[PDB]
Every structure is written in C-alpha cells, then in structure tokens.
Amino acid sequence: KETAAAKFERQHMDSSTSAASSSNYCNQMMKSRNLTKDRCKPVNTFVHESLADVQAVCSQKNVACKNGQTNCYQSYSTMSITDCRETGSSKYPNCAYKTTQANKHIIVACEGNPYVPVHFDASV
Amino acid sequence: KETAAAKFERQHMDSSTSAASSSNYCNQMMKSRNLTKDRCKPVNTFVHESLADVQAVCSQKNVACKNGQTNCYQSYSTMSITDCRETGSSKYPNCAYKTTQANKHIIVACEGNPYVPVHFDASV
Numbered sequence: 001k002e003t004a005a006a007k008f009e010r011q012h013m014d015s016s017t018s019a020a021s022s023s024n025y026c027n028q029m030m031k032s033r034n035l036t037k038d039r040c041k042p043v044n045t046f047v048h049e050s051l052a053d054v055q056a057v058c059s060q061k062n063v064a065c066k067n068g069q070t071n072c073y074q075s076y077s078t079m080s081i082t083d084c085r086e087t088g089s090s091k092y093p094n095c096a097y098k099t100t101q102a103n104k105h106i107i108v109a110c111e112g113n114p115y116v117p118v119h120f121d122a123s124v
Numbered sequence: 125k126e127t128a129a130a131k132f133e134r135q136h137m138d139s140s141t142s143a144a145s146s147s148n149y150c151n152q153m154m155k156s157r158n159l160t161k162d163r164c165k166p167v168n169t170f171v172h173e174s175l176a177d178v179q180a181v182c183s184q185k186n187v188a189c190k191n192g193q194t195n196c197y198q199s200y201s202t203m204s205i206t207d208c209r210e211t212g213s214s215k216y217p218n219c220a221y222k223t224t225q226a227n228k229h230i231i232v233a234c235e236g237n238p239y240v241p242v243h244f245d246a247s248v
C-alpha cells in the first residue's frame with residue numbers, strides 16, 4: 001500500500017540525523033524501519049540529508065543504473081550516508097549489522113511526476 | 125572455459141598500476157578487459173593491489189553478500205580502487221564511462237579450493 005516514493009523514504013532516508021550516532025545505529029534503524037521483519041535484509045544505506053536535497057538529485061548528473069537503463073542520477077556533491085551490512089554472526093531474529101558512516105556521492109533511480117527517487121543504486 | 129578465479133582477475137584486478145592514471149582510465153580498461161564487447165557493461169570496479177593482498181581478504185571480516193549468502197568478506201584496510209560508471213550519453217559501441225579513483229574497503233565473495241575471490245560485491 002506504500003507508493004514507490006514512500007517506500008524509498010522508509011528504506012533510505014534519515015533526515016533527522018546528520019550522521020550515524022554509534023556502532024549500534026544500524027541494529028536500531030534496520031529494525032525500526034521494518035527491514036528485519038521476516039528475515040535480515042543483508043545491505044541497506046540511509047541518506048542523512050533533507051528530502052528536498054535528495055529529490056533534487058533527479059535533475060543532477062544523468063548516469064546508467066546498474067541495469068543499464070538511464071533513469072539514474074548522481075549527486076553533484078557528497079552527502080552524509082550510513083552503510084548497514086549484515087555481519088557473519090547475524091541470526092534472525094537477532095539481526096546484527098556493521099555501521100559505516102561516510103561522505104559520498106549518491107546515485108538514485110528516479111520515476112514519475114514529479115520525478116523523484118524510487119531506488120538507491122549506489123554510493124561512490 | 126575461463127575459471128571463476130581467472131574471470132575475477134580479468135574483470136576486477138589491475139595490479140600493474142597504483143591508481144587510475146587519467147580521467148580516461150575507465151574508457152580504456154573497460155574496452156581492453158572485454159567488458160564492452162557486446163554491450164556497454166554499466167558498472168565495474170578495478171582493484172589496484174597485488175593478487176596476494178586481494179586473496180587475503182577471504183580470511184578477513186565475514187559479512188553477508190548482497191544476495192544473502194555468507195561467503196562475503198570485507199578488507200580491514202582500505203585498498204586502491206577505481207569505480208567505472210557508464211555515463212548518460214554513452215551509446216554502444218562507444219561506451220563512455222566516468223572514472224572515480226578512491227581508497228575504500230572492498231567486499232568480495234570467495235569460493236573453491238584454494239579459497240579465493242570470485243565476485244566483487246561492493247566497496248565501502
């Protein structure tokens with residue numbers, strides 16, 4: 001029942017924080033965003049910028065997405081992001097993640113009218 | 125009839141250089157390693173480290189792979205990498221890429237006997 005855009009926000013936006021607070025950031029967020037519900041989602045990235053700032057990427061540098069289609073866009077500037085990666089030890093339902101904070105360019109897949117981010121392609 | 129190990133070396137290893145020479149590195153390498161043969165491969169990463177240093181990652185930090193498997197490992201130290209991303213104006217056969225040189229941790233998938241990298245999962 002969520003739109004593609006609402007789904008993108010749930011999964012990948014964390015405007016409320018400038019950066020991953022601690023080593024436990026991912027353990028907390030993966031769970032509160034419902035990404036640990038039926039199974040441990042293995043990888044996920046949260047962007048720490050305003051929604052408008054992220055929506056603006058859809059008119060920035062046009063690039064190929066991982067699938068070869070060209071509805072992907074690379075941000076002009078670096079953005080604050082947190083990478084969450086399931087660790088070796090992790091066992092549903094006690095899903096465990098490694099938290100990495102970085103300043104990188106983002107690449108998103110855009111769709112619709114208005115043209116907004118619907119998928120997180122990669123960080124560079 | 126190429127081995128998984130040899131395919132990983134051809135598509136993801138560039139030990140002969142410490143880093144991407146120029147802005148043109150990706151255009152040249154994607155073509156020489158045959159990744160632009162029938163189509164423009166949209167994304168690719170090259171690691172500028174010795175084979176020995178990359179094979180050693182198979183015994184470093186165990187993490188989940190993108191696909192959920194648990195035969196993935198993250199290097200403890202950053203390594204010299206080159207990110208290749210197909211631009212929005214690229215049209216086969218004139219595949220065009222954007223070159224990004226950086227120092228990042230790598231995540232590889234390992235298999236076989238001996239236990240070596242066979243797939244490049246991501247850089248972090």
Ligand SMILES: *CC(=O)N[C@H]1C[C@H](n2cc(C)c(=O)[nH]c2=O)O[C@@H]1CO
Pocket residue numbers: 008011012065066067072109118119120121122
């Ligand atoms: C949270 C999220 O965006 N997951 C995405 C990433 C990946 N994806 C899909 C498309 C269509 C693309 O162009 N590039 C990507 O990286 O798929 C998940 C959704 O299926």
Ligand SMILES: *CC(=O)N[C@H]1C[C@H](n2cc(C)c(=O)[nH]c2=O)O[C@@H]1CO
Pocket residue numbers: 135136189190191193196233242243244245246
């Ligand atoms: C050159 C290369 O490694 N391509 C890989 C990237 C991706 N992949 C596969 C597996 C099995 C994995 O665990 N993690 C990945 O990122 O798919 C290509 C394999 O054809």
